[PDB]
């Protein structure tokens, strides 16, 4: 168990202020007692111990993906009616944030050191058999030296709800077992991971100006999305795009393969991220 029963955090772990309310609650800065380091932490109160076993299943998650570019779990306990979860800060915050403080998307240099970054995080997680399934600029967390962090496995805990002859089955029915079960829904991360590189360049994704329940069927039916405004962007980026927005995902890459692509390739240094995090740093301070 990764999850302390005994040991009250507050001999550890210490609050100093709030961060954010944006759908699933609140979100503390949190220091260290003895060391001294900083954590973001979430404080639950639990409606349902049956319930409880989703953020304990996040917790297992985290806990087993050691990665550069996933967040560290830095402790997690349960005491009183209470659970804690403390996180490596990442003090550079979400790249939709950023995008919000200065007023614009990223340049492509940057979106090919975020997109590198993601691949190689896809690509291990999906060797472990895990799945994102909500991947967004709003998720992709950075540190001050230029990196990401992947942060939130809220939806990717649920769906290991699976952890609990068919000569008559439709096929509608078979496709989204074996859709949703292996080979075929690691892919999914792959078409999530191109929309938020096109909310990166136009900072919203695509089909933003729609209402929410008319979007799933405009997904549905539409041709995959593509850059607005084509003349600003390589061909590279278009191209990247182009493949990784298949929606027959038998055909759709894995991460492993678009880190073959021309597009990130070459990328050996993430110089463009750094610049972007100091610019944003500079900016909150006016
Ligand atoms: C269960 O373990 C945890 C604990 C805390 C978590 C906090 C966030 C988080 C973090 C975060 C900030 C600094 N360091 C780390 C994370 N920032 C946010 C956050 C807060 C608010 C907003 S907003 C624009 O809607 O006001 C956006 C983000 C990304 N979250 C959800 C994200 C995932 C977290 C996971």
Wanted: hydrophobic share 40%; with cysteine; glycine share 4%.
């Amino acid at each position: 168990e990764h999850v302390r029963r005994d040991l009250d955090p507050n001999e550890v772990w210490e609050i100093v202020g709030e961060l954010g309310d944006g759908a699933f609650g609140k979100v503390y800065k949190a220091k260290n007692k003895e060391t001294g380091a900083l954590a973001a932490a979430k404080v639950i109160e639990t409606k349902s111990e049956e319930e409880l076993e989703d953020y304990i299943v996040e917790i297992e998650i985290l806990a087993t993906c050691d990665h550069p570019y996933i967040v560290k779990l830095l402790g997690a306990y349960y005491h009183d009616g209470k659970l804690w979860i403390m996180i490596e800060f990442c003090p550079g915050g979400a790249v939709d944030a950023i995008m919000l403080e200065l007023d614009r998307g990223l340049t492509e240099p940057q979106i090919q050191v975020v997109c590198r970054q993601m691949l190689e995080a896809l690509n291990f997680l999906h060797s472990k058999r895990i799945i994102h399934r909500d991947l967004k600029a709003g998720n992709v967390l950075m540190t001050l030296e230029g990196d990401i962090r992947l942060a939130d496995f809220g939806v990717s805990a649920k769906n290991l709800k699976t952890l609990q002859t068919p000569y008559w089955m439709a096929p509608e029915v078979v496709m989204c077992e074996t859709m949703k079960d292996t080979p075929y829904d690691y892919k999914a991360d792959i078409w999530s991971l191109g929309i938020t590189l096109i909310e990166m360049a136009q900072i919203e994704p695509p089909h933003h100006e729609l209402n929410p329940m008319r979007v799933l069927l405009k997904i549905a039916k539409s041709d995959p999305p593509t850059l607005l405004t084509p003349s600003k962007w390589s061909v590279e980026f278009r191209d990247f795009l182009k493949i990784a927005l298949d929606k027959n995902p038998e055909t759709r890459p894995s991460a492993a393969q678009l880190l073959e692509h021309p597009f990130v390739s070459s990328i050996t240094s993430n110089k463009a991220l750094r610049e972007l995090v100091a610019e944003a740093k500079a900016e909150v301070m006016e």
